[PDB]
Amino acid sequence: FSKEESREFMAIFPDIVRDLTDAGRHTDIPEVTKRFAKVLQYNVPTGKKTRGLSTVIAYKMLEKPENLTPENVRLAGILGWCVELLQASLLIMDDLMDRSETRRGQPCWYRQENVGFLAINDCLHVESSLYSVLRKYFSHLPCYVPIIELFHDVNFKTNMGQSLDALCMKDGRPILSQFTMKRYSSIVKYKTSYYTFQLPVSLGMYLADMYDPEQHRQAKTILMEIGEFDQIQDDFLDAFGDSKVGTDIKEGKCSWLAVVALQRSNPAQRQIMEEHYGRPEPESTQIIKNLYIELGLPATFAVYEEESFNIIRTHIHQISKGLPHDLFFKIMKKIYKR
Amino acid sequence: FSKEESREFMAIFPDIVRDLTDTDIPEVTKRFAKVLQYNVPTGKKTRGLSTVIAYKMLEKPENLTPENVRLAGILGWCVELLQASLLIMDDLMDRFLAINDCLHVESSLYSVLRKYFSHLPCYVPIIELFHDVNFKTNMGQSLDALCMKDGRPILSQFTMKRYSSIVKYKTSYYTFQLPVSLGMYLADMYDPEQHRQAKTILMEIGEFDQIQDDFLDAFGDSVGTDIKEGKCSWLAVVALQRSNPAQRQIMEEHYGRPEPESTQIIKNLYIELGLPATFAVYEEESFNIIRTHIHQISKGLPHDLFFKIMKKIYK
Ligand SMILES: CC(C)=CCC/C(C)=C/COP(=O)(O)OP(=O)(O)O
Ligand SMILES: [Mg+2]
Ligand SMILES: [Mg+2]
Ligand SMILES: [Mg+2]
Ligand SMILES: [Mg+2]
Ligand SMILES: [Mg+2]
């Protein structure tokens, strides 16, 4: 993203914290409002903010140029921060569920002194807070109700994704019979692609007064295809990228690598996965990495990266109902880095 | 609640489960049906039935159609979905329930609202009420947690002002305000002054409800764990107001400890400090104040609704 777009977006965050903690609403409980400021300051504004900024980009590529006022671009930024509020809520909870040590370079929120399982309340609180932001800045606009309904629906779908991911684990141990490409695809769609890709684009559309369910559906078909590649590349680089140190094997994740390894494995190779996948010992991670190398997963990913890129590019050329192709090409180029 | 009211309310629940669960992801949808079935419809449903009663006592008789009473029942089930999300979060904090099931069950009430209410004039006030009540409930949960540090109760925090705030935010908003404000909105009663007048009485009733509960935790016939858990209970707050330095040291030493003998030491102190007699004086004085405020209720609100709520809490 541009320096001007990044700085404009970052300037909004302190106002959202004031709106949620210092707007003279709850003056009888200052210790709680001061704490919630710290919850927001720790968990919301330190990332790359890809999803927030992408909300602004989407809006700027969907709206008529003559409607792109500083005021409307700031509303897009506020919607972006609501996506970053939802994400913060989801990751606070996922870290507690996964018992992770760090997120985005920082100790996980639940590990901070006197949090622990109180992170569940903080998760609910941060997600609830975005609706207060929506009421303040959007209650007077026609997009208000569609935007509220989109956030609640995406929250419900993301929960289905997280729960489906959990149905791949039994008492801390991966259930390898569950590691199918069909279930993988479903996990990625529900758990990540709705909030990562569909939510920013649909928000841009609503702010631009695009309400045609068919325009949203066309955008969704493409964004779910891009989202699937984004998570597959992420899974690949967890094991094969250059040092973030990847822990997906130890964690027993239903990764694209594990799914494709099980498709390709002879019985001896399947037994290695059963014995060593999702185990804590370093030598068990190395055994799984070595099996991924033996099964040719690097070549497999290289072929998938080229084929998927060509299929998505073809599908974007075929988009209709006046959706701008350049937006979908721009999202592709960010994800494929070409 | 009449047999007819209870039975009509219960008949809605299977529809709500089908609405939310019945797809490319049938194994996780089936699981979510079980999450709902196992956690939402069991036990008394006082908050959801209160929403129906509020609507029936607020609406014009001519508008009380079977169809509108069913809409009130659906709003009551939305309150019960929020209750279930809060009981799940409590079960998770105590401990096939998954940690995200509390978030998922809470999110599901907004899908029910969209389904049944999105075309009605009351829709935005209702969704905004749920949004605000959720935020306030979370603030109250956080304030309760600020009364504990490193596993020990912070007795300097145990003030009546903080106790009243905890009860208001954590409990009374969603238990008492939300059912009545829903009944009002469904009956096209939008006037902020009417909601405010109801709120004054409902927060007083909610305060007595929690104080009675706190009293019975220690003094009721069973099994109460407030003392062992170091809870910011009315008994602990008043004990600290009434204690001399020797009595305060007994609280510092024994409040919030795991040993059964420490719970008996604290119960003995509550007896020594006359907490039972203090509760008797409060129950009589609060009953009189609340009855007075109900008789004074204005802005065209019905007395009988608030008397009914008061009578269920005080018996
Ligand atoms: C309803 C909830 C709480 C959803 C969580 C959403 C999410 C993006 C989880 C992280 O995935 P992960 O655990 O597979 O990977 P990591 O934690 O390593 O990012
Ligand atoms: Mg996870
Ligand atoms: Mg995780
Ligand atoms: Mg990853
Ligand atoms: Mg990780
Ligand atoms: Mg109790």
Numbering used by the authors:
A (entry chain A): 86 to 328, 333 to 427
B (entry chain B): 86 to 107, 112 to 184, 202 to 328, 334 to 426
Study authors write:
Here we characterize a metal-dependent, bifunctional isoprenyl diphosphate synthase from the leaf beetle Phaedon cochleariae by structural and functional analyses. Isoprenyl diphosphate synthase in P. cochleariae (PcIDS1, EC 2.5.1.1) produces FPP in the presence of Mg2+, but preferably forms GPP when exposed to the heavy metal ions (HMIs) Co2+ or Mn2+. Inter- and intramolecular cooperative effects in the homodimer strongly depend on the provided metal ions and regulate the biosynthetic flux of terpene precursors to either biological defence or physiological development. Strikingly, a unique chain length determination domain adapts to form geranyl or farnesyl pyrophosphate by altering enzyme symmetry and ligand affinity between both subunits.
